Design a protein around this nucleic acid. Structure first.
Lengths: 282, 282, 282, 282
DNA sequence: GACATGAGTGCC
DNA sequence: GGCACTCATGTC
DNA sequence: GACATGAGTGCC
DNA sequence: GGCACTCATGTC
């Protein structure tokens, strides 16, 4: 019903692929041609369906009756999740060769910073499939079920996770430290201490995030990349990244990435999705 | 170009009247049939125009060329400024006779919490008109002039106001502590310490805000009401509110306001704009 | 055995009486001519007996073998307890008529700041006698018994009280809050966070003490007076003191108390022990 | 002429020699048959003299008239400086071989924790004779001279070094950071943050000290050793200690030293003063 | 007596 | 109006 | 020696 | 991965 446009090229096959690998059962549904999930904005709840019209390079968004009163906010959330503001020319031009194998590459955002915070923490260590399944168990235990869509469940809110029992979370298959990380993050979101929108100084912001128990450099970087969709951040600590730069230390890698500023977040995505890639031995 | 729905009744005459008295020259233009202002979403800039359509219960939004990449976020900003989410039947059902005279009353929000915080601060102990002109000076002195629309300036970024000279601001017409208050707020906005969207615990978030220099209970409440669009906050320390409640002390007003929960913000507006209103002598 | 001097006059009956009223069963023993009690100095423990000799203004101190290795710390603890340093000519000269009825009055200190801290906390709200009853109970359950002197038990150390169960202390006859205050104090004691000797800036240190849970202004002052032997502190919040200044508010008593600077601690004691004292008819 | 006991053996020659090299001109006077120094306790001041009596295993202490009022505290200060509490049969029965050559070794204490902290700071990275000459300058500029004994001067008090101009301190022969260290230290001493007596948890307290500006691990360890007279601390970061354990890392040194628990401080003193000492093949 | 809350009174 | 700073209340 | 930075190790 | 702790290293 609602439509949002984008600037070609846009690789929808990759975006949905990325998102489908990380989909949380009962929360999200990802198909080759559309994306849909439960969505909550305040006390308004429902389901959102996004259908990409390649031909006319536009995204069709349908909203369940419950979200109509806050239609625009839902639209802004989809635009952030799908990085519709991206001008591929500027990025593909500034990255030269690195972004030529797939110039439609977009930065997968999120629909809610808190959710992404929870996802980022649970993403620690385990594989993607495990992170997803782990997140699914948290949603099934603390999420809100939609009365008009019994198959859908809303992602847990800060009010529920903040009151959660550390041992209950532990029981879902996570260390006690990670459960406490979640409970503390929820409390921050309630208090208004978790930046829900990109701050002017992403560097200071992340430094403050690292004071949170259970959140280190990796988590804060990954949270900034996906949760604030900050476009200039690298993850020299990432497992797959450390494999793309054999023999180099976090600082050497970090020093190498300076060359891609101010679009380091994009460079990161490309290097991640190019198995053959390797650095230039200066 | 873009259109947003709203549920009747909606008193546009009153809404535009409220924004018009507080309009900042060079930043926004308010007329009988429309509202327009500069808008910055990251590096994207332009002018937004809002034209209500009573016949269709719709609001038409026009974005200048520079804001199209982030059109959805702009739509969301406008929906928060004009309280398009409001269901008057629900609010009026609860408020009873209090709102019966103007069932179309809405809660005027803002397009950005930082800006609103700056405005809430410059409005301390001065007339709406002075605060208006005062803010304009700060605007011209630190704003980003739109190239495509020379007469429009974007509101100062936390960036620019954080590195401002506490004196260059006092000069414009404010005590020294007033200027420090702004400079502090700006820094907070830079690292994400100022909540940009409403937190789960409004009570607690306001407490933290009150630890800010230059921000007391009044400013913090007014900020929650307009900047976060919190719907259940009252302003017992407001000068005018004290006149509407002859005699009574803050805790007594607050106690009497309890009867309008969970829509105290709306009740507040109805009382502010109802001349001879007075509590039940009961 | 060991002997220490003091300067006449010294009202030993008033002093011994004062200590008898607060004496804790199993820890101390007070008679009309001597004071004796358990005493721990690190890992060294034993019994100390103090016998005054009015004729030659000397105090004879005896130590059981367990304390011999730390003789001098024992002597210092005893001299602070009995305020052997006092020069009555100076203090009585400054107070004037206030202290002319008992020129031999001294400031009863303590043998250990941690102990006094526990004693001050348990002295909250209740009567002198009842507090001694409670302290005796706490010591009974958490103190160590001297092998060499079964009849005696050492006052509970900080490490023992720190690892005590709040519920176990609650049962002895105090609210849960009060018992938590004790456990917190023990922790500060272990960490070196509770000044054990009088600080250079008593006012500042007392302020720091008030941040402790369970410790308000009364407990901090009283503790500073007994635990540090601060000579210039008044107790305007004291029960009996307010009874000596009928109808006067805290800040009033405090301002009045100023004329006794810098010996307010001594004036305080003189007022407590003047049956019919009343502020000057002026 | 007061008298204190000690258990034999006691190497006075070694003790006086250690204090003699660190003697600060005008404050302490060291000779082979006696130690003498100015001393303060609150506002009572004077000169203390200590005469060892090998014959009767006794130490004779004489106090000038200005200290008599607080004689007991003065005796405790001396017993801590000279480690009179030490039972050599117990320490050596544990250290074995290592302590067999100088069974009379004692732990040189201090007369006051603040003073010792200052010396720990001014002894950093400079020779011993140099720290002595520098400290003497500070004592000379910030000390209260004694009226009864013109030749002697009191060590600086915390209130005085606190109101010190950094620049003034530096000019005496030290970097700025250091002078700043002394000033912070005085403040802490003033508000009661610097533990003046050994705490229940020496390790926790040493960590809290490491957060003071200018105090690292070597300074904390050393301060604890001499300022609190902690009997079980080792200094794996010491210049000479690194030389005694050739090619060993601080962690390896520390692991090795565990064989001397719980008397690591005495082990440290024996190893420090044993030229050519070296570790076994453990 | 500790501690959070309410009054208010006066000052940049 | 922010900010402090001093009484007066009312549970545990 | 204090103290930032940076690799690296070992245990949640 | 987080995080406390360890081993250089360069600076003042």
């Amino acid at each position: 019903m609602y439509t949002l446009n984008w600037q070609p090229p846009y690789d929808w096959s990759w975006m949905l692929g990325f998102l489908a690998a990380r989909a949380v059962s009962s929360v999200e549904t990802v198909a080759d041609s559309y994306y849909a999930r439960s969505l909550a904005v305040g006390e308004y709840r429902g389901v959102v369906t996004a259908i990409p019209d390649i031909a006319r390079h536009t995204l069709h968004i349908n909203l369940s009756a419950g979200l109509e009163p806050v239609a625009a906010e839902c639209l802004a959330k989809m635009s952030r999740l799908f990085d519709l503001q991206c001008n591929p020319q500027i990025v593909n031009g500034a990255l030269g060769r690195l972004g030529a194998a797939r110039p439609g590459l977009r930065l997968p955002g999120c629909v809610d910073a808190f959710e992404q915070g929870v996802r980022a923490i649970l993403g620690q260590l385990v594989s993607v499939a495990m992170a997803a399944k782990l997140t699914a168990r948290v949603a099934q235990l603390y999420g809100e079920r939609l009365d008009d869509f019994p198959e859908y469940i809303c992602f847990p809110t800060p009010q529920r996770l903040a009151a959660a029992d550390p041992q209950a979370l532990k029981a879902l298959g996570m260390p006690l430290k990670r459960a406490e990380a979640l409970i503390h993050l929820a409390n921050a979101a309630l208090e208004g201490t978790l930046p829900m929108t990109i701050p002017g100084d992403v560097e200071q912001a992340m430094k403050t995030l690292q004071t949170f128990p259970g959140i280190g450099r990796w988590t804060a970087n990954y949270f900034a990349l996906r949760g604030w969709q900050a476009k200039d951040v690298f993850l020299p600590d990432d497992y797959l990244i450390k494999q793309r730069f054999p023999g180099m230390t976090p600082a050497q890698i970090r020093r190498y990435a300076e060359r891609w500023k101010p679009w380091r977040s994009y460079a990161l995505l490309h290097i991640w999705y190019t198995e053959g890639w390797q650095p230039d031995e200066a």
